[PDB]
Symmetry: C2
Subunit: 379 residues, 2 copies
């Protein structure tokens, strides 16, 4: 019988009741907007996490690598969008997945990448499904939402080239820089409007564009309306994290992934407890540093998961985390409060970064038992 | 020659690997291994490399073949993997947690000469009571704080050293030594300050061992080291071994501390260009922070390299171009000086392969299930490494 007292530390624990509440909150919001949810599994890369998202009503998945496409397809999921601008050298891998039965969709934002796909498809007998990525907020990839000549030149390359022009997609990743409901709502409207504008421009040119796909977790939870959109992609919401708490779309109490750690020593004069969760456990992500409340390398909670405001990991080496007062003072008699061997749970800055440090999650049930749920590492 | 012809057909190079990949330039790696071992031989001290930078059996095998004595590990899973691969002299250099004692016992009962460390009377009492119960005289070293980096017993705290050392010795354990790590060396960037810190690290660790021996307690090993202080110490009188790990590859944090050049950096991430934002001067590559890690140790140093220094496919630095930003699977390649490069698409065409030098080799390596060990003939081989605990 494995439980939080028996596991070695550090371990990545998913509180299944918290995870199920986050899954239902997002699916209920997408149902209220009349759109499909295509979760981004790059947050967990774990078959049972994605199975719970499917069981609640999700439609297909988004993946960040073809390794995730291979994993999820070998587990029976066939409706897979690889939402990273396609590199031509990966075309043989993509072809072999489609010929095996995976309905794998690729994305592009240039004439040259569309040309490479379409020439390879014609040669190989494969009508690849490709969507066009639209830049709606200046974050990263994509055809500018008002760069119509580029949008139509790519769309005609794919459609006249014998490929299946399946849709447009955008990701308003600048939402991570926001922290008010008004700014998130307005960005969610800019994301929706730009993605719909590109679809209408394709359709107006006589090109197919059946899918309009938007999303980030903060804009998926903030959008007031989603007219014109067929699906939303969101991923970090399945666990949440402290970055999301500071953006304002969840509370710390909603964060379903924590790192179980043991106190292995102290520095009494500085008021430090040293734990065995360093940055190799937490990752080096320090997304909260650029936000209105800095949580260091994570927020401390007790073994029951009660948040302990005011204690955070103020520093981290590879295998040692430094727990101390966030107010800078040296806690008096820190060893008397957290004796050697005490177990604590640390909430992460960024769930996608912390999860990737572990070979598996420990999925925590209501009775206190855990089941190990493997996840993917690498490419 | 059936095996030959098939092996040739299957052989990878930097053109045929999928990206991103973590590439070890084996010539650079061997130059780093010989440099550290020669330095320690010249100092008359053993080198006990810290394998937590690579966690890879062939990398440790190269360090052992060059003359290393034992290893340091950061987790008991590293002690399990390297003992199964034939390494018997292993120091687990993280404050021992009582609940890990059954795994440390099982490793010693299989034949691993595993050493543990402590820095408190309670951890010493837990080891000694488990060892008496189980009939095992564990070997334990006392960790010393010589530069305020983390924690450890103060080198001048005779009453706490004696109490921890008597708890282990009177308890029937083998008090085997003292160790320190002057991790504050990562904040320095001059040879004068590094040499001084390495002397403070030596002096304080020997001071602790001299105090234990003055009370009649054994303390035969005195172990010091970080890569920067190993390379800078003038003298090592009284020290029996040095531990250093990131030197096997180096990285840009080390280049900035000034103990290596960018051309000594033996680990790089092979990446492909997958797109552009022409008006911002950006090339997008498939090495984001999941490949590089989120480490940004160069941001507070003399030269900020973002998420890494861009090199061409031949490994040569392309000055002025860095990964200025990174999302999980996408890295943003742009000018470090903040200008928008003109014709970025012509400077970096779609499908171009590049190599990115890491901020911190320990952090970048852990993002990969294996390295691709690049030989002089351009051939790679997959060298697995450990992930997790
Ligand atoms: C293309 C694409 N679609 C959906 C998501 C999921 O966003 P959430 O994690 O906010 O739900 C992402 C996430 N991208 C991360 C990243 O590191 O790439 C970031 C840009 O916001 C995505 O890229
Ligand atoms: C206990 C111990 N010994 C040796 C080293 C190796 O130092 P280099 O990597 O500089 O050769 C370390 C390294 N510790 C890292 C860390 O992330 O823990 C840091 C404090 O320098 C060490 O801890
Ligand atoms: Mg994320
Ligand atoms: Mg390191
Ligand atoms: Mg284990």
């Amino acid at each position: 019988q494995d439980t939080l007292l028996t596991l070695d530390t550090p371990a990545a624990v998913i509180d299944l009741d918290r995870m199920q509440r986050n899954i239902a909150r997002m699916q209920q919001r997408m149902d209220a907007q009349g759109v499909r949810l295509r979760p981004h599994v790059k947050t967990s890369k774990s078959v049972p996490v994605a199975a719970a998202q499917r069981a609640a009503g999700a439609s297909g998945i988004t993946v960040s690598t073809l390794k995730e496409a291979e994993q999820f397809f070998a587990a029976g999921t066939t409706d897979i969008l690889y939402a990273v601008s396609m590199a031509p050298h990966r075309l043989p891998q993509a072809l072999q997945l489609r010929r095996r039965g995976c309905d794998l969709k690729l994305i592009v934002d240039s004439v040259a990448a569309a040309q490479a796909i379409a020439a390879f498809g014609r040669e190989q007998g494969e009508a690849f499904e490709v969507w066009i990525e639209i830049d709606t907020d200046g974050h990263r990839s994509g055809v500018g939402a008002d760069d119509t000549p580029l949008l139509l030149a790519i769309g005609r390359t794919l459609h006249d080239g014998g490929m299946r022009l399946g849709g447009v997609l955008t990701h308003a990743g600048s939402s991570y820089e926001l922290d008010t409901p008004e700014a998130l709502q307005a960005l969610a409207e800019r994301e929706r409007a730009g993605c719909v504008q590109a679809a209408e421009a394709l359709r107006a040119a006589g090109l197919p564009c059946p899918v309009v796909s938007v999303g980030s977790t903060p804009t998926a939870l903030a959008a007031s309306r989603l007219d014109g959109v067929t699906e939303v992609r969101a991923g970090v919401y399945v666990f949440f994290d402290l970055v999301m708490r500071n953006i304002g779309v969840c509370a710390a109490e909603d964060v379903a992934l924590s790192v179980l750690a043991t106190v292995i020593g102290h520095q009494a004069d500085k008021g430090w407890a040293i734990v065995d969760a360093g940055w190799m456990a937490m990752s080096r992500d320090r997304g909260t540093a650029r936000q209105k409340q800095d949580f260091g390398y994570g927020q401390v909670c007790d073994l029951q998961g009660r948040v302990m405001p005011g204690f955070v990991l103020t520093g981290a080496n590879q295998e040692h985390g430094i727990l101390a007062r966030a107010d800078g003072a040296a806690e008096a008699d820190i060893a008397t409060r957290f004796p050697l061997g005490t177990r604590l749970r640390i909430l992460p800055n960024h769930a996608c970064a912390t999860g990737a440090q572990f070979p598996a999650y420990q999925a925590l049930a209501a009775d206190g038992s855990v089941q190990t749920w493997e996840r993917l590492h690498g490419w």
